[PDB]
Design a binder for these strands. Structure first.
Length: 17
RNA sequence: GGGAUCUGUCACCCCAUUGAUCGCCGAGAGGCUGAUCUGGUGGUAGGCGGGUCCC
């Protein structure tokens, strides 16, 4: 894929960025 | 060696469900991070590896 990440609504987002 | 913007990672919470899909529990609406993905120089919230720019 052109890009990727690791994010989960209702729980976490600073786990990636 | 230091700081931030960049990236990769890990326990917290917010915002968008007129952003997208699923799973589980629930007669039922409803609930759960339960799994995944996306987005906010939202957060002097914490740590660590790589790279960039400045000093």
């Amino acid at each position: 894929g052109i890009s990727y990440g690791r994010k989960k609504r209702r729980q976490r987002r600073r786990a990636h960025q």
